[PDB]
Amino acid sequence: QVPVYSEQEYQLYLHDDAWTKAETDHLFDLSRRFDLRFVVIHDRYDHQQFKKRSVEDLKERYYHICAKLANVRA
Ligand SMILES: [Ca+2]
């Protein structure tokens, strides 16, 4: 299952100089809807609003957040 971060969690812990919350939210939405199939997530990505991201860029962002949430929720 895809983790769900709170707004406060994002603000305190999940910022990245190269990602908006809007884009991160989009990644996590696609991750839910497409069952973590990163080829599909990559295909369906709103490359209009957001930068061209590699599949690898998307996975690294997702699992950085997973690791950070695991830690702060301990
Ligand atoms: Ca799902």
- Please say whether the beta carbons of 62 and 14 come within 8 A: no
The second-level CATH assignment, the architecture, of 1-74 is: Orthogonal Bundle (1.10)
Distance from the alpha carbon of residue 37 to the mean position of ligand 1, in angstroms: 10
* Experimental method, per PDB record: X-ray
Which tokens hold the place of 36?
Answer: 């973590």
CA angle 23/6/28 to nearest 5° reads 35
- Please say whether the beta carbons of 43 and 58 come within 8 A: no
Closest C-alpha to 23, from 3, 64, 51, 42: 51
Which phi and psi angles does 44 have, rounded to 5°?
A: -95, 5
Residues with CB under 5 A from ligand 1 (ion): 32, 35
Distance from the alpha carbon of residue 62 to the mean position of ligand 1, in angstroms: 14
